[PDB]
Amino acid sequence: MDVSYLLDSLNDKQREAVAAPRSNLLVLAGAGSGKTRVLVHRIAWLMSVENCSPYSIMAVTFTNKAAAEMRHRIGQLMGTSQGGMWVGTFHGLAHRLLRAHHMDANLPQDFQILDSEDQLRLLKRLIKAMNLDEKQWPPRQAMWYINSQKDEGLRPHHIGNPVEQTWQKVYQAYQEACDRAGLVDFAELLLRAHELWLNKPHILQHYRERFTNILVDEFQDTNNIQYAWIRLLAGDTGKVMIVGDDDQSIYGWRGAQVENIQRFLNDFPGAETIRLEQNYRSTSNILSAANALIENNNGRLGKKLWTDGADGEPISLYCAFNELDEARFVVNRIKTWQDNGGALAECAILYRSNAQSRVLEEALLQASMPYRIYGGMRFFERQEIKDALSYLRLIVNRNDDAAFERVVNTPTRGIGDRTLDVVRQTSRDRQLTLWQACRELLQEKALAGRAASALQRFMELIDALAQETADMPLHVQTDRVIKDSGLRTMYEQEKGQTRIENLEELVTATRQFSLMPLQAFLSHADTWQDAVQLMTLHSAKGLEFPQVFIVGMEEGMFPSQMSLDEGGRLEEERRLAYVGVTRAMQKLTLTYAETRRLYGKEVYHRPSRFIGELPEECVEEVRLRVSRPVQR
Amino acid sequence: MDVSYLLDSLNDKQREAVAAPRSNLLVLAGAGSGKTRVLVHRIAWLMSVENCSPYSIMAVTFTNKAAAEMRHRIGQLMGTSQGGMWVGTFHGLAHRLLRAHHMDANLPQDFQILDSEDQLRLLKRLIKAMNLDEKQWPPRQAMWYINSQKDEGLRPHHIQNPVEQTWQKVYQAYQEACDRAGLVDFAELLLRAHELWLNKPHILQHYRERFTNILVDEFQDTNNIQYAWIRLLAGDTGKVMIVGDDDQSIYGWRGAQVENIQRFLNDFPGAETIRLEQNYRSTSNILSAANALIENNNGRLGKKLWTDGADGEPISLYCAFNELDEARFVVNRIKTWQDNGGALAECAILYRSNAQSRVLEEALLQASMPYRIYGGMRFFERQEIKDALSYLRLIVNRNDDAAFERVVNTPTRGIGDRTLDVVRQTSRDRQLTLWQACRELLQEKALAGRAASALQRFMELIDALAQETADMPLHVQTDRVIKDSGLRTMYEQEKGEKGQTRIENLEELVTATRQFMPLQAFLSHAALEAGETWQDAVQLMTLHSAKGLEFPQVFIVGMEEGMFPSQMSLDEGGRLEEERRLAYVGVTRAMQKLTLTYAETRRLYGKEVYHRPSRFIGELPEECVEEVRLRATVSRPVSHQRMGTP
DNA sequence: TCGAGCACTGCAGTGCTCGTGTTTA
DNA sequence: CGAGCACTGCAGTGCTCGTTGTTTA
Numbered sequence A: 001m002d003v004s005y006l007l008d009s010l011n012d013k014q015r016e017a018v019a020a021p022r023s024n025l026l027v028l029a030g031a032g033s034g035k036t037r038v039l040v041h042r043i044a045w046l047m048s049v050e051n052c053s054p055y056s057i058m059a060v061t062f063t064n065k066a067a068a069e070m071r072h073r074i075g076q077l078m079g080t081s082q083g084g085m086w087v088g089t090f091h092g093l094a095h096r097l098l099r100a101h102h103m104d105a106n107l108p109q110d111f112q113i114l115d116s117e118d119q120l121r122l123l124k125r126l127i128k129a130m131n132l133d134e135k136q137w138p139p140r141q142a143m144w145y146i147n148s149q150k151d152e153g154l155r156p157h158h159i160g161n162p163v164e165q166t167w168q169k170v171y172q173a174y175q176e177a178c179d180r181a182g183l184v185d186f187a188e189l190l191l192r193a194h195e196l197w198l199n200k201p202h203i204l205q206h207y208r209e210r211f212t213n214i215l216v217d218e219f220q221d222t223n224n225i226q227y228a229w230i231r232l233l234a235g236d237t238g239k240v241m242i243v244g245d246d247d248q249s250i251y252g253w254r255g256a257q258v259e260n261i262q263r264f265l266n267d268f269p270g271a272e273t274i275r276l277e278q279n280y281r282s283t284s285n286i287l288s289a290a291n292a293l294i295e296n297n298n299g300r301l302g303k304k305l306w307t308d309g310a311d312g313e314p315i316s317l318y319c320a321f322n323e324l325d326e327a328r329f330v331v332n333r334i335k336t337w338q339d340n341g342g343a344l345a346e347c348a349i350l351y352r353s354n355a356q357s358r359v360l361e362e363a364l365l366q367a368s369m370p371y372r373i374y375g376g377m378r379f380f381e382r383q384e385i386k387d388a389l390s391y392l393r394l395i396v397n398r399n400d401d402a403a404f405e406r407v408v409n410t411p412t413r414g415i416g417d418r419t420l421d422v423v424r425q426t427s428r429d430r431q432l433t434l435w436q437a438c439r440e441l442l443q444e445k446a447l448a449g450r451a452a453s454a455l456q457r458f459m460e461l462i463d464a465l466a467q468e469t470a471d472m473p474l475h476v477q478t479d480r481v482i483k484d485s486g487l488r489t490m491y492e493q494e495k496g497q498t499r500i501e502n503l504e505e506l507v508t509a510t511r512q513f514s515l516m517p518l519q520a521f522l523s524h525a526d527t528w529q530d531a532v533q534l535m536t537l538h539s540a541k542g543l544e545f546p547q548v549f550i551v552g553m554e555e556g557m558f559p560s561q562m563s564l565d566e567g568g569r570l571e572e573e574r575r576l577a578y579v580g581v582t583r584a585m586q587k588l589t590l591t592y593a594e595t596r597r598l599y600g601k602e603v604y605h606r607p608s609r610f611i612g613e614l615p616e617e618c619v620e621e622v623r624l625r626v627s628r629p630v631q632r
Numbered sequence B: 001m002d003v004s005y006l007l008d009s010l011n012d013k014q015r016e017a018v019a020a021p022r023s024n025l026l027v028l029a030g031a032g033s034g035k036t037r038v039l040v041h042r043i044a045w046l047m048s049v050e051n052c053s054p055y056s057i058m059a060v061t062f063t064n065k066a067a068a069e070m071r072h073r074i075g076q077l078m079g080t081s082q083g084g085m086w087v088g089t090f091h092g093l094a095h096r097l098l099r100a101h102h103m104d105a106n107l108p109q110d111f112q113i114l115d116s117e118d119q120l121r122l123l124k125r126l127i128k129a130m131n132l133d134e135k136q137w138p139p140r141q142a143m144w145y146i147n148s149q150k151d152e153g154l155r156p157h158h159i160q161n162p163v164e165q166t167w168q169k170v171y172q173a174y175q176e177a178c179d180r181a182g183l184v185d186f187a188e189l190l191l192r193a194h195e196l197w198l199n200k201p202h203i204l205q206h207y208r209e210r211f212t213n214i215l216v217d218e219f220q221d222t223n224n225i226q227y228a229w230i231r232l233l234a235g236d237t238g239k240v241m242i243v244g245d246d247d248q249s250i251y252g253w254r255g256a257q258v259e260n261i262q263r264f265l266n267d268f269p270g271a272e273t274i275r276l277e278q279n280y281r282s283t284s285n286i287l288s289a290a291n292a293l294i295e296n297n298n299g300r301l302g303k304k305l306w307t308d309g310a311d312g313e314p315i316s317l318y319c320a321f322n323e324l325d326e327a328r329f330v331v332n333r334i335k336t337w338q339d340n341g342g343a344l345a346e347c348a349i350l351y352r353s354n355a356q357s358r359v360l361e362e363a364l365l366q367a368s369m370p371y372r373i374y375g376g377m378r379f380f381e382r383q384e385i386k387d388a389l390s391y392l393r394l395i396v397n398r399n400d401d402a403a404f405e406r407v408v409n410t411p412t413r414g415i416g417d418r419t420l421d422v423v424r425q426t427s428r429d430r431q432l433t434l435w436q437a438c439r440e441l442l443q444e445k446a447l448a449g450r451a452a453s454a455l456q457r458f459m460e461l462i463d464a465l466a467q468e469t470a471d472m473p474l475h476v477q478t479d480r481v482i483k484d485s486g487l488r489t490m491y492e493q494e495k496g497e498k499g500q501t502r503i504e505n506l507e508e509l510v511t512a513t514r515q516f517m518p519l520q521a522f523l524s525h526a527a528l529e530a531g532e533t534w535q536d537a538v539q540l541m542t543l544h545s546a547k548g549l550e551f552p553q554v555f556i557v558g559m560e561e562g563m564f565p566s567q568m569s570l571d572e573g574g575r576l577e578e579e580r581r582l583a584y585v586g587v588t589r590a591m592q593k594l595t596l597t598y599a600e601t602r603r604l605y606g607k608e609v610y611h612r613p614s615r616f617i618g619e620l621p622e623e624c625v626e627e628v629r630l631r632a633t634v635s636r637p638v639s640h641q642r643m644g645t646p
Numbered sequence C: 001t002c003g004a005g006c007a008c009t010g011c012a013g014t015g016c017t018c019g020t021g022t023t024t025a
Numbered sequence D: 001c002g003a004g005c006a007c008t009g010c011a012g013t014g015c016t017c018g019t020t021g022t023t024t025a
């Protein structure tokens, strides 16, 4: 309300952005200059000065992390009276639109989302089916190919070419398998929803009417299908605010090209730019490091932020003996921080790839220090969880090929490979769902003796649980199914436990969760406990922390080897470095190991070039500081 | 004792053979003329008149039933009390020798006898290990070879063609294998024992000095290695008596050739023939039939065979509508005989092959009619029994290949196929046994993890049973081996169908031992006992096993072309006159009444076949046979009807 | 008939081979 | 190094296809 409390903190350029006329505006600026602060306040202003309805406001961005930040800051300022405005990820909002419109979207109301592992598998089987050798046409290669097409909003038909006309064939097969199965992968969510507004002008006209105010954070993350989606939703009616930093462009590998920025200026009516120039997040030391670091990339522009702040502590650089010594030294410095009254949560440990988290996790455990690893939607990746959730999915729909496959013979119940190759082929040949094929092959006797009887048993079971829990609440249904499938019995007696604990926790998760049950759960997914924050440098973008530790600062790790090999992704790695550095508020610490063990082999990586690119006066090497003098 | 009685019964020619000087004599005569009587009485004569020692008399024959038959008449004439007199079969006495002289024979003090089944199985393994094609050298066709050779006395040596040299090798391979394992097959008993005298003159001496009185019944049963064995023991000092009938020569398939009767006349010092002619067993009708029947074979010096007896009842002839009806028909006839005071034991149901006894049994069981099937050693051939004994055999000699195989993975010990394929090689190459080739590959760790894990558990288990039941008697010793080997629990589950009587046989095997080198000696007691327990029961056995015996009522079933004469016999040509001789034997077992039956149809090897009655039936004299009528009046003669109406 | 030999199928244990890398409900 | 196979091996379940007969401890 009190417009005065909206403008008090803001500086010149921020004010101009927040208190501007309703127009298409781009706020371009480096890290920690208040772009997100601006976007959030701009929402408050659209509401009290321009008296705009909360319903006409869509705040969207790419990662869950960044969306949560927006969502969070929007609460602190407007005490969650926001009820009405849409604040989420592109995928999230796309999902939302496709659910409530599955009809014009040619999607069965209870469509299932196909994640990576599930997509990877459906592709394997689909290729092995099409009678194609795994090594000549690798599954992953097909996934990348397919997702890439959708990232560009290209359907199979849209595409005279070489040995990709075949890939173009696998793509088409895949679509068919998914549609028939009622599955939708991530890339699909965005593409479908876009098509939605292209073939249902009345639905589009509806939204253009509702969402007159569109705001996008971390804009340089948006790829082509996402850009189009927004340009479309805006038309000539919508007024949009995009904020970003081309220096933090780190999703090239998924279609997000820097150009989408200048593109916005060319495409949206009367588009204009506002440039923030003052950093408020970090000490002068960190910021000078950042600027120097980014300054190594070519082209760019040269905006350079500045700060009143004092130099502050230096950037710590510790050369660990190996990956264990690395984790240990980090956990050590966090303790000191804690012992002097610092919150664990005010500390983040950042790495280039998730693989690096295991060693850190063990050191943290080994020191009884609480922590959170944001593998964002990874708990449901764990074998046991994917299995449990698969029975449920079948219960929801038998056509969930992905689900049918994962447990038809898990736990083992006769139904072996042979029996299945028959069923699979049936689906391939008669264009049916794995369950649809079984339906027939049974009422056709075609199956063997103990064979058609093992399959019969199963199908009786799946349908059996779909009755017993057709009343029970998701929290108890997820309990019964787990025991009545033998998943419990089968896991317990495995030797190698912690695995079964997760199943029980899944029960609790479903238990304390906000038709509904359907997706509602698997989708949306206890923070009061102070804990150390662990996440990839990519996920950290948009976030900030008082104490920041970036591990694995070595050539081959960061910059990753891939980037090093196909020598072209290096300015992007340096931009990711920039992200990492600009995340630190008070203290930044970078560590690297003289030796670590990868693919069972000791390697001695050279120190990352990024460490050297930092100004010597901001970096201070960590030097460590007798034991009793030296019977039988 | 009182000579007077040893001769009172006898007729002219019988007397001349019984009360004759100690010399080599041959009594050649038709069936039921008293040859066996003569032979038994000769013994008493050689004992009271010639004052010979019972220890000097050896009465030998080929079949257990025939031998058992002598054993009985001897004991009835001289009162069991007959010192150390040897009465048994060739193989049996041959066995008794090799046992009391294993060292000189070169056999372990426990050599195990390899029956027809194991022998064939052992040949399988062996044939594979030589990478020889399974159907290029059939193991069956191999067993037939080796044995035929031994029947002659030949050893691997035999040479003089490609095929020849092959088998020759298979043969030798086999021999060696047995010697290692310490296994002896039936043919090995006769050949080894023969050799034992050719290779131990002092030993032979001992026996020639002991058995100066040799008597053989059913001589025409002797083949070459058996003739040799006798000519030997007799040398130039022994006095032998052989009795037989060339018309009852029914073992050509195993060497026993008619020639041996002349050979005896040529090779034995003083040899002389005595011919009997009066039959005392059968009714005139029955004899008239046997005679008419045998005359159809060519090349017969025309043996006498007459009788004072009345005509007696006709030969009953019955055409059944199927095999089961045939059984119930016999059971019906035997029942009428029993209901009139006759004894079931005076009734024999004879047949061409053993398979034919299954339906008879079912019928008798169904009628609650006590019957005994003289199958011989076919109880220990049964699966559950073979296994149970395969264990005990290993406990008495780890080198028992035959055994080791069988029980190694039974009950499933994890020791699967390939695991053995190797040990099989570890033996074909190393030149060891299966247990020796195993104890090696262990303290040599040349086998996988899961593999050697169990293959050791096995090795250990048998050794455990050996050292655990080493004391206790045989009957309880068997009770432990059975249960503690898993078998008790194995055959316990498995079916819940036919696996029911399978476990009860293992119990009967326990009883058999309770009512008794124990293990090997156990098997011999059974071979005897397998030949006549006076609890009135109908007798079932083959026409072969019956030769030598007699019964008031006889029933020959399966008088069908393709059964008797068996199909095969029809191919070889010369086998046919042998079948007619087997038919002669059959007819001549009947004392009072004979009944022949044949089925309109029967299912052989899952197929409803339709045979024509056996030619042997028509060969009999019509005035000797009365067919069992299946209808009251004779089919009224119907005149011809002029109809050009197709 | 039906038992041994052959192909089929499922499941458990084993060396041999070789590489998500970042996000998305 | 460790998930993923490709392999080897033991078992259990239809099948066919092929059968041959007598005795011996």
Ligand SMILES: Nc1ncnc2c1ncn2[C@@H]1O[C@H](COP(=O)(O)OP(=O)(O)NP(=O)(O)O)[C@@H](O)[C@H]1O
Pocket (backbone or CB within 6 Å): A009, A010, A011, A014, A029, A030, A031, A032, A033, A034, A035, A036, A037, A038, A244, A245, A248, A280, A281, A541, A542, A543, A544, A582
């Ligand atoms: N005018 C201001 N006075 C005081 N604090 C401010 C001001 N503007 C922004 N901040 C704070 O400065 C920090 C950085 O702001 P933030 O809005 O997160 O930057 P950003 O531009 O979104 N960075 P990035 O996501 O890295 O591109 C936050 O802690 C804000 O709360």
Ligand SMILES: Nc1ncnc2c1ncn2[C@@H]1O[C@H](COP(=O)(O)OP(=O)(O)NP(=O)(O)O)[C@@H](O)[C@H]1O
Pocket (backbone or CB within 6 Å): B009, B010, B011, B014, B029, B030, B031, B032, B033, B034, B035, B036, B037, B038, B244, B245, B248, B280, B281, B547, B548, B549, B550, B588
């Ligand atoms: N002189 C006799 N007086 C009375 N009964 C006799 C006489 N001779 C033999 N028998 C009996 O006649 C039957 C047949 O005798 P047996 O000695 O068995 O004949 P066999 O010549 O051995 N016949 P086979 O073995 O078939 O070639 C038996 O019941 C004898 O007990």
Ligand SMILES: [Mg+2]
Pocket (backbone or CB within 6 Å): A035, A036, A542
């Ligand atoms: Mg921001």
Ligand SMILES: [Mg+2]
Pocket (backbone or CB within 6 Å): B035, B036, B217, B548
């Ligand atoms: Mg006789």
